[PDB]
């Protein structure tokens, strides 16, 4: 800081001296300006007006130049002078963003201090090529059970979370973020810590504040950052926020570290791009979108990658989110984003109201990476679980008509109901991998078939407390070895038997 009289006045006196390329505004409307001049402009560079507002030059026509404004157009007055800075639009990167909330351009909005970061990065960049990459072999612990078992996620993947409104899309990502605080606290190896970036496009600031509050309540902000391009924020900011997030994540990807980025409401980006192109008089396509939507999302999602041992070994995982209307996934945007991703996580309202929460349909949901992004101990259980759930999904529709079936089919129905009641979870209540392994072991080896379904919701909880109280060694062994030897098998079976002996349920 500084003092007014002796310092600031001297500074302004030193500031006032001035006399005698540049351009002038010719047309203004709807957050977009059309200039005449600046023949040496780079397509895509920042532009500064004579009132502090900023802009980005996109349409370098012959007569005029098309700039999109980062704010309101009340400042521009059709004749204002305009100057080019020469900088391509760029954002800061570093660990100074961790714990902070910033707009699309790196300007903070938490209201507590500036951004201490010295190195910047260009927004639009070339993705890495075929050679500086490697296969996906490490898992990304989501904290959920159905995901971590049947729809695994790796480090370097690009997995879509597609569903309807109010189905549990943001909650999946927030649980993925919350599950990492234990993994990060129990280490000081940055190669193993997982940092996080949450890009909120189109959301309202109340929602973003609620998410920040939910993370601060759980100490899940010292390894995350947020990029809020809300609805009041102009279309170019909603357009640039995901690319700013990818720029912030490429620091982790390139510096040997790992990262995960969640683009929330990725359709608002396409809405904003439609808006910009239609106000820049570019011609539309079908549903009024342009043709550059594929090049809009491919640019963004191809920056997620798993680099080789020569480029550090980092990663940048992506988890975009999409809201469909009436479950129509035959549309243009869902189809585009599905055709450029390594998996799918479908979410349904029928399953959301039937009682299945998270409401993940494990039939349509897939993961092309699959078991490579999955632990052996979890493979052993999840294979059987997927088979049993497939059989249950096949048979239950015919079974529900009150027909009378044999015991080999009654067992299928019982085990499927048990697993379906196991995979339910509370919001913001993630679980460790070893605990998921133990619970799914209890569910798969038949310690829930005779038990009542409605009781499982406490059979789980109590069992968890039991194995967190008296059997920490099993969890530590599973966490370290990442497999189930016969010793751990027998110990877990004995622990489950002791628990069922010590406790009593309705069956």
């Amino acid at each position: 800081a500084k003092i007014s009289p002796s310092e600031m006045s001297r500074l302004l006196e030193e500031r006032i001296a001035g006399w005698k390329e540049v351009g002038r505004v010719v047309s203004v409307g709807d957050g977009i300006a059309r200039l005449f001049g600046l023949e040496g402009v780079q397509a895509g560079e920042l532009v500064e007006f004579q009132n502090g507002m900023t802009g980005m030059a996109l349409n370098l026509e012959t007569d005029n130049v098309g700039v999109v404004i980062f704010g309101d157009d009340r400042s521009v007055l059709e004749g204002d002078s305009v100057k080019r800075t020469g900088r391509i639009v760029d954002v800061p990167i570093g660990p100074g963003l961790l714990g902070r909330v910033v707009d699309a351009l790196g300007n903070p909005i938490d209201g507590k201090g500036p951004i201490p970061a010295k190195e910047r990065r260009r927004v639009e960049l070339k993705a890495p090529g075929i050679i500086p990459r490697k296969s996906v072999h490490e898992p990304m612990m989501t904290g959920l059970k159905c995901v971590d078992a049947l729809v695994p996620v790796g480090r370097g993947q690009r997995e879509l979370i597609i569903g309807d409104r109010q189905t549990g899309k943001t909650a999946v990502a927030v649980d993925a973020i919350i599950n990492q605080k234990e993994i990060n606290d129990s280490t000081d190896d940055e190669s193993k810590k997982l940092y996080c970036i949450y890009v909120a496009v189109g959301q309202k600031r109340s929602t973003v504040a609620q998410i920040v509050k939910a993370l601060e309540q759980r100490d899940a902000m010292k390894y995350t950052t947020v990029v809020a391009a809300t609805a009041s924020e102009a279309a170019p900011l909603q357009f640039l926020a995901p690319y700013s997030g990818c720029a912030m994540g490429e620091w982790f990807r390139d510096s040997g570290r790992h990262c995960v980025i969640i683009y929330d409401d990725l359709s608002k980006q396409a809405t904003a791009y439609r808006q910009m192109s239609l106000l820049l008089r570019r011609p539309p396509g079908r549903e009024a979108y342009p043709g550059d939507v594929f090049y809009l999302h491919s640019r963004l999602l191809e920056r997620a990658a798993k680099m080789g041992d020569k480029s550090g070994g980092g990663s940048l995982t992506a988890l975009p989110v999409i809201e469909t209307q009436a479950g129509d996934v035959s549309a243009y945007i869902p189809t585009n984003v599905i055709s450029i991703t390594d998996g799918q996580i479908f979410l349904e309202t029928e399953l959301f109201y039937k009682g299945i929460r998270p409401a993940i349909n494990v039939g349509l949901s897939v993961s092309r990476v699959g078991s490579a992004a999955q632990v052996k101990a979890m493979k052993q259980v999840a294979g059987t679980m997927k088979l049993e759930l497939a059989q249950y999904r096949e048979v239950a529709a015919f079974a529900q008509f009150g027909s009378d079936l044999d015991a080999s089919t009654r067992q299928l129905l019982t085990r499927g109901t048990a697993l379906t009641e196991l995979l339910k979870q509370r919001q913001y209540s993630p679980m460790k991998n070893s605990v998921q392994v133990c619970v799914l072991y209890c569910g798969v080896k038949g310690y829930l078939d005779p038990l009542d379904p409605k009781e499982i919701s406490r059979f789980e909880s109590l069992f968890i407390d039991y194995i967190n109280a008296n059997h920490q060694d099993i969890l530590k062994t599973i966490e370290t070895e990442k497999e189930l030897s016969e010793k751990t098998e027998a110990k877990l079976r004995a622990a489950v038997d002791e628990f069922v002996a010590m406790n009593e349920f309705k069956k």
Partner: protein
Amino acid sequence: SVKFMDQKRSGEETVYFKKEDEALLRNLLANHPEYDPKYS
């Protein structure tokens, strides 16, 4: 109606042919002992 009929059909066929495959697995090795590896 569509997923309804499809899943009902699939379940009914699965149950029927599961029963039939159980019966055939019971009565296979008798009528075809040349395949039974128990006798080889």
